[PDB]
Amino acid sequence: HEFAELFYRTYIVTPDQAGFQLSIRRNLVWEGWTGEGLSGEKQEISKRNILQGLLDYTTLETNSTELIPVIQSGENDEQFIDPSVLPAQTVKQGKDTFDTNFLKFSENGEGFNLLMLAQTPSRLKKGSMTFTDSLDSRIALKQLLISVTKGGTTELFALDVNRDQYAAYTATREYNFRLMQLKFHTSLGLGEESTTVAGAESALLKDLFDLGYRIELDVKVDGEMNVENGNGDTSLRALRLARVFDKEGKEIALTDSRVSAALSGLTVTGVGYSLEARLTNINQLEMGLLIDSDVQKQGFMIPTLPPLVIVKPAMVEDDKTYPRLEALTTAYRIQQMRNNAVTTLLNRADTLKSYLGVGVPHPIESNLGLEGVGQYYVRPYYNEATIDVLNDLNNLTSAAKQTDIQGLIVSKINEMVYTADQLTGYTAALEAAFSGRSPKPHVAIGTDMRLPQYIQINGDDRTVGIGYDYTIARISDLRMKDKIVMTFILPNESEPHPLQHGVLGFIPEYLVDFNMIRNQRIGREIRLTPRYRYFNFLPIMLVINVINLEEAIAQRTALDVNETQVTPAS
Amino acid sequence: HEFAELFYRTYIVTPDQAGFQLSIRRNLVWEGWTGEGLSGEKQEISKRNILQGLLDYTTLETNSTELIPVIQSGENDEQFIDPSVLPAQTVKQGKDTFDTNFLKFSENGEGFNLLMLAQTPSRLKKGSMTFTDSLDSRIALKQLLISVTKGGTTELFALDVNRDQYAAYTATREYNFRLMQLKFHTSLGLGEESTTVAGAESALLKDLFDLGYRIELDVKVDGEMNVENGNGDTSLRALRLARVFDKEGKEIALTDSRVSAALSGLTVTGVGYSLEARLTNINQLEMGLLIDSDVQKQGFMIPTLPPLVIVKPAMVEDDKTYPRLEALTTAYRIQQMRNNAVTTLLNRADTLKSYLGVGVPHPIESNLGLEGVGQYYVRPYYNEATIDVLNDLNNLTSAAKQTDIQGLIVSKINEMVYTADQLTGYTAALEAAFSGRSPKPHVAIGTDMRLPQYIQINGDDRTVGIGYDYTIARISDLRMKDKIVMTFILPNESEPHPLQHGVLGFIPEYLVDFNMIRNQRIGREIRLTPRYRYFNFLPIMLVINVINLEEAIAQRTALDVNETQVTPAS
Amino acid sequence: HEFAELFYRTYIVTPDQAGFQLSIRRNLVWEGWTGEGLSGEKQEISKRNILQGLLDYTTLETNSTELIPVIQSGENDEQFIDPSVLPAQTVKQGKDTFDTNFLKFSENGEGFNLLMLAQTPSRLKKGSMTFTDSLDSRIALKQLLISVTKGGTTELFALDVNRDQYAAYTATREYNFRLMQLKFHTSLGLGEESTTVAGAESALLKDLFDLGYRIELDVKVDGEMNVENGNGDTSLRALRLARVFDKEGKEIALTDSRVSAALSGLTVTGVGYSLEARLTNINQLEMGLLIDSDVQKQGFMIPTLPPLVIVKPAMVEDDKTYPRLEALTTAYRIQQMRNNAVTTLLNRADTLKSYLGVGVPHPIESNLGLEGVGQYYVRPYYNEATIDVLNDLNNLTSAAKQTDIQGLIVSKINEMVYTADQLTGYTAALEAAFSGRSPKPHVAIGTDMRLPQYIQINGDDRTVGIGYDYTIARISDLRMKDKIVMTFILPNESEPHPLQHGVLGFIPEYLVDFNMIRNQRIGREIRLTPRYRYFNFLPIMLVINVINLEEAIAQRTALDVNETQVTPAS
């Protein structure tokens, strides 16, 4: 029966075993483990799976290797700018908490060693780096800090210079092969919507900004650094206010009165900078986050079901007298394959109602009381809506009523399916589970013989299919009256997998021929014993219950006659 | 002529037979015969069609072989929970009625024999069981009843547990090869809307539920049972409150003031449980429902009809003077096919209206007075609706009338089609008719040659077939002026069948050439006497009576001049 | 996914080099160097890119071989018309300013030497010689200056004669092997829309023109020219009023009273004429615009990133037991591609917003502080718009609300894309870049899960593009919630190109196996150091911020009651 296979696919189970088991490969991200205490009770291991990383990014992030300058009281305060220019900043790295600040411009020729400044509390406990830690080929500046001062007022601009094709250190062989040199000569443009470090609007250049002007600073930076021992130095060579431009981009001279007043007594000066430094770790000293593999596996069972029976006299041949075969087959089909499936679907819907709540997502590894193993691959989610067609629409005419109902119902179904999809990330689960092919996720829609007049859109073939494929079903059961139950399935595959909506564990049972005495009357009989049961993996379901449809359609035949019988005029 | 065979398939019939007969092999499910008392009156055998099971699910279902704990007052109540906690409940299996209740959690180590803690009156009458039968491989917990006591107020919760796979007994031998144990190791959660046993929202957990909080209970249930002889045990091992969830999934401890108020002195203890267990019926102790085949027969006769005659002067050749039979063929075609088709169709329509009335469905096999054998498969149904085109609409402009009329007619016709198909279950019957392919049900639209400009809506790929296919036919008869006749037909088969709408039993006709002397005339004569008859099988028909359409058409020429003649402005 | 490579075409590079080096070529057109610094100050060679000529018509223009008369006091006054009738006109060719005026009909029969009147001051500086030159075969008159005078009022009509094919000089070698003939013998018409040289409408013919008549005169002008010698003469032979037309194209005689009064005493006199002459430039006298090629180059380098770790028992095989490699590959794929991709995309969007401003384009070549190389090819442009779903739309009854939302979204996206294309000139650069192929520019539109229900409109295949190709992708990050990102990409190419959007610099790294001691343990550390980078090229992005969408969606179910339960009427 068509409705059956669309939600539960036939998977033949051999009669030898009494069921089938499934294995789940769960991958998890380690954070740490139970150190030294003295309790004697449950110790808890902190575990999240990677699939949580599909929902957000911060759960899987590490910068253990990145070289970061670190400030210590009275040991390297000389090479950093004093906190009277900009207070210390807090940055979190690994398990340590430490403060950092912009490096001071060394103009006299004095050098600085980045490896000395790059000692964090984590690396100190490990010992001290000797000469093995090698700086990678990528070194660049985070920001250049330029000081705009006019009349004693100081404003700082954190200009991201890392986004430039002249801001990366380049190898250039002069003395040694491990020496990296820096050659930075661009025209840094300070815009008109830029803000200071704290975020406030700039006040020393507000007048030019109000006229729609942007100012060009010509910057000249020289530096060199050795990747073997980390010694080196950086110098500022030239920085001066170069040009002023209008809205469209015509040059305006510095001595012109349009910009002289705002730039009178205005000086630009370099203060500090940072470096994008990172260790090769040829010998490895860091660990970062760990990864673990665990399998949580569940068993599934194949019941038996109460038998069917046929009566027949024995002494004659059954070849051409009294029912053969087709009676039992039809009874089995109708009784067993359809009605039980509908009952299972309704029970599943109500079970989700009971356990999960309406419209409220739950994080992965949610309540385990839910049927199936879908909760290791996707957020559980259940939503319910009710549409009263009579309330939302008022039109006496019957001409376009049915089209309007189509529009309303399709609007509801598409909106709700996309909201559920975004809240669940099911597509993210499919695209993570398969590498090489990414079949388009499939939404199945089951309903009775009344709704399908409202899921179509005239002149259209994209009805619920905008980024998905659809397949609608039809069923005659009364409990399935005027309601739509929808969920996700996978067209391609036909064996158990934690993303199939449901699987029907089936075992075929054979015909049986025995002659049973009954009240001193012998009658040979044929017994057919069902063995099957519908199972449920995915804990996702969506139900639209359309009520009071009859009266709206009656309005087609209950209109107050708008009749106008006037004499023809031409 | 298209309108003819689109409704009746021309089934050839051999000239030797006087007609064709159909045998309809019917499947009937036995229920019971009344009158084994000695009275000597007609016994009435309650036979009901399985095909009626397409609509209802209570047609074929049983739970007789599955074992149910039966209360036997004064002998085995010790194994049951005291009904002072929960009153006894009655259930129905087969023709027996008995009261049931939850089995008590035995911590005192003495168990229960599930076989002998069962047996219905029917099983006792057939004979008390003697280890003739074993138990099924699948046994699982069905319901857990836990009592919530806080401040002297007790609330009972009937939790459905059968949808967790840790309650399904797992085969693991250590003593016998038929001994299975149970480990229930998970958490049970109570939602903000979980109804209690009384059938309403809670009153002690209402404070948490109203704020969107959920409570999780960790449950630790173990049990042992052997299918060999019904030996078994089950004990409660642990129960406490584990954690509390907010409306988002962040954990909140018991100590927190938001949840501590409603959990002070809150004690939860499980009191009882039920069992899902059943007999293997290897010995076939139990009788199932019965299916029998009965055969029905209908005979149809092919009659003779009035002749047609051409007079021809005789003593000359019959070849190239006076009609060479062309007039015979044309008259034969027209007279014997086209007029008779519409005659039979309209008479059948009024015949259906006479018996079934408007919009009144009938139960299956409830009428035998109607023509046809379709009553053995589908519900008889006849409906009638009239569209007053002018009175249902109000528009003046001539331009949009076409689209508006098209929309109205399509809406009404499609709604009628779907309502009729839902009320008849025709599609389910068609699906059950064949295995391996289910042709899409086909709707026939035969109407006069005025309307068809309205059944098609411009820009529609799917015109009237949203979940069906259609074929449009036209005829020039004056009787069908502004009328639509509808049914369901089978286009891909050409043979008689209970699901065929109608068939032309046709006989090839042999030309007769005898010379008859008529009033002393010696004239060559030719005879072409037809024999055929139109039949009806399916008692399904829908008629659309469109009246007053011409006036709404002329309303295009009846608008009251809307002119706007003003000087151009730009 | 698809989203990642859809915006950053993956490019593999050999692990032997720290990155890939890129070189581009530029074609610039030379005008002149602005300034000689006798103080030693720099010189600025004013260069502009040639592809700037795709959007303008002026920055590359040539006029250096036209032969244009030059007025000289006391040297050629008698060859020019009276300056009183028409003052001197200013004309620019090359870098010389001079005055030119029309040449009078030489009825005295003494000719002119064209190579004299058109010697430019550049040629005077170039030397003084006009006798190795040769005139091109193409000679034709620019304009005939006819004087419409009546009673002392003079009007001048600058009539473009170059667009009549009888004004082209034709070779008639009948006197010498280098003479060519001029015979312009036809009728020119002065329509109602005829405009004077100063730009005013006609005054003497205003009476007829207001009566919609058209006046055409027969022009009979003859002349000769010699290329080798420069000798030639052209004299007026016959000019006269000819005939009069009406609106319907029906000839009106000159003697008619309605026109005779306004045409008697009206004298039409030919004042001056000009010639189109071009030097064959067989002798190399003029250098056109000079264009030069200079090369710009940038180096793109790849970093190394923090590693991932697996802990593992060390005494046995690393192959067939315990956490395998698929854990590693899954962690790598989810972490290093996706998260860094979206981070880079968002950071680039905000960086472009910060430096460039909204709605203000910049000329070809601009501030260099933006990464990329397309700035050398196209105009930088950034624009962002915020659509307010709730405020912009007002619909109560659910039906076409979803359709209306699609209308909003499509309107915004189409207008943004097309306006950006016009202000950037992307398509011109694309077609200029490739010879032999020119795919229609492809627009990439990637967003989160919920919005694609509005990106396409129902009923068509051309969704977001009328002359473009598009690909819609979905991403699952929360950062990209309810926002749309747009830019241009090129699918066919798979290698770095100035018009490509961005490149995924990839270097594969092998995983290492060794022996490790960690905190006095013997374990296995399977290690992989990832190396990858995302580079930016095109400084063009379009961003849409969708807000209050949830309120408008709720407005579907927030409509007030609209119900009319009226009695049936027909």
DSSP annotation string for B424-458: HTHHHHHHHH-SS--PPPEEEEEEESSGGGTTS-T
CA–CA gap between residue C326 and residue C306 (Å, rounded)? 19
And the tokens for B270?
Answer: 């499980």
Task: Give φ, ψ of A460 to 5 degrees.
Answer: -140, 150
Of C81, C156, C150, nearest to C112 by C-alpha is C81
Mutate to test the interface with B, among A318, A335, A562 (most CBs of B within 10 A): A335
And the tokens for B58?
Answer: 């209570």
Beta bridge partners of B48: B29
Mutate to test the interface with C, among A411, A437, A563 (most CBs of C within 10 A): A411
Residues 6+ apart with CB under 8 A from A306: A530, B62, B63, B64, B65, B66, B281, B286, B288
Is residue A376 within 8 A of residue A363, CB to CB? The reply is: no
Q: What is the dihedral of CA C557, C563, C569, C570, to 10 degrees?
A: -20
Chain C interface includes B545 (CB < 8 A)? no
And the tokens for B35?
Answer: 């009158």
Beta bridge partners of C502: C536
CA–CA gap between residue B164 and residue B276 (Å, rounded)? 13
Q: How far is CA B24 from the centre of its chain?
A: 21
Between vectors from CA B480 to CA B476 and to CA B484, what angle results, nearest 5°? Answer: 110
- DSSP summary character for residue A452: G
Decide the pairing of beta strands C442-447 and C469-474.
parallel
Burial class (CB in 10 A: 0-12, 13-18, 19+), A548: middle
And the tokens for A384?
Answer: 């319910």
CA–CA gap between residue B261 and residue B206 (Å, rounded)? 12
DSSP string, C276-343: E-BB--TT------EEEEEEEEEEEE------EEEEEESSS-SSSSSS-SHHHHHHHIIIIIIIHHHH
Is residue A369 within 8 A of residue B144, CB to CB? The reply is: no
And the tokens for C6?
Answer: 């859809």
Is residue A344 within 8 A of residue A505, CB to CB? The reply is: no
CA–CA gap between residue A248 and residue C53 (Å, rounded)? 18
CA atoms within 13 A on the CB side of C232: 26
Terminal alpha carbon distance of chain A: 61
Mutate to test the interface with A, among B26, B57, B170 (most CBs of A within 10 A): B57
> H or E stretch including C218?
strand C214-226
E strands of C85-229, at which residues?
89-93, 96-100, 103-104, 112-113, 140-150, 153-160, 179-190, 214-226
CA–CA gap between residue C443 and residue C451 (Å, rounded)? 17
One-letter amino acid at B468 equals Y
- DSSP summary character for residue C435: S
Beta bridge partners of B277: B67
Beta bridge partners of B337: none
Is residue A562 within 8 A of residue B394, CB to CB? The reply is: yes
And the tokens for A62?
Answer: 């590490």
Q: How many contacts (CB atoms, under 8 Å) link B and C?
A: 6
Long-range contacts of B469-472 (CB under 8 A, 24+ apart): B469/B440, B469/B442, B469/B443, B470/B442, B470/B443, B470/B444, B470/B445, B471/B6, B471/B442, B471/B444, B471/B445, B472/B445
Across the interface, whether the CB atoms of A137 and C303 are under 8 A apart is answered yes
Nearest to A165 among C330, C371, C476 (CB): C371
CA–CA gap between residue B289 and residue B284 (Å, rounded)? 13
Rg (alpha carbons) of chain B, rounded to whole number: 37
Across the interface, whether the CB atoms of A432 and C334 are under 8 A apart is answered yes
Residue ranges of B 376-405 with Cβ closer than 8 A to chain C: 386, 388, 391-392
Across the interface, whether the CB atoms of A307 and B288 are under 8 A apart is answered yes
> H or E stretch including A312?
strand A308-312
Of C181, C60, C69, nearest to C114 by C-alpha is C69
CA–CA gap between residue B360 and residue C97 (Å, rounded)? 101
Nearest to A53 among C335, C563, C567 (CB): C335
Enumerate helices (H) and strands (E) in chain C, giving the number of each: 12, 25
Q: For residue C569, which residues of chain B lie inside 8 Å, CB to CB?
A: 391
Of C470, C457, C483, nearest to C545 by C-alpha is C483
**Using what technique was this structure determined?**
cryo-EM
- DSSP summary character for residue C255: T
Across the interface, whether the CB atoms of A560 and C567 are under 8 A apart is answered yes
Across the interface, whether the CB atoms of C569 and B386 are under 8 A apart is answered no
Centre a 10 Å sphere on the Cβ of residue B458 and count the other Cβ atoms it contains: 10
Mutate to test the interface with C, among A25, A392, A393, A438 (most CBs of C within 10 A): A392
Residues 6+ apart with CB under 8 A from C292: C28, C30, C47
Give partners of A (≥3 CB pairs < 8 A).
B, C
Across the interface, whether the CB atoms of C309 and A291 are under 8 A apart is answered yes
Residue ranges of A 8-27 with Cβ closer than 8 A to chain B: 18
Terminal alpha carbon distance of chain C: 60
3-class secondary structure, B331: helix
Chain A interface includes B550 (CB < 8 A)? no
One-letter amino acid at A251 equals E
CA–CA gap between residue A185 and residue B481 (Å, rounded)? 91
Is residue C440 within 8 A of residue C417, CB to CB? The reply is: no
Residue in this structure with the two tokens 């036809």, named with its chain if needed:
C186
Residue ranges of B 265-324 with Cβ closer than 8 A to chain A: 278, 280-281, 284, 286-293
Is residue A56 within 8 A of residue A428, CB to CB? The reply is: no
Of B352, B365, B370, nearest to B296 by C-alpha is B365
Residues 6+ apart with CB under 8 A from C411: none
CA–CA gap between residue B459 and residue B467 (Å, rounded)? 18
Centre a 10 Å sphere on the Cβ of residue C58 and count the other Cβ atoms it contains: 6
Q: How far is CA C511 from CA C310, C472, C528, in A?
A: 11, 35, 5
Q: For residue A333, which residues of chain B lie inside 8 Å, CB to CB?
A: 432
Q: For residue A452, which residues of chain B lie inside 8 Å, CB to CB?
A: 418, 466-467
Centre a 10 Å sphere on the Cβ of residue B357 and count the other Cβ atoms it contains: 12
Q: For residue A339, which residues of chain B lie inside 8 Å, CB to CB?
A: 53, 57, 60-61
> H or E stretch including B235?
strand B231-245
SS3 content of chain C, % helix, strand, coil (to 5): 20, 35, 45
Is residue A216 within 8 A of residue A188, CB to CB? The reply is: yes
Q: For residue A163, which residues of chain C lie inside 8 Å, CB to CB?
A: 348, 351, 369-371, 536
H helix runs in C211-319, sequence order: 257-263
- DSSP summary character for residue A560: P
One-letter amino acid at B212 equals G
CA–CA gap between residue C12 and residue C506 (Å, rounded)? 5
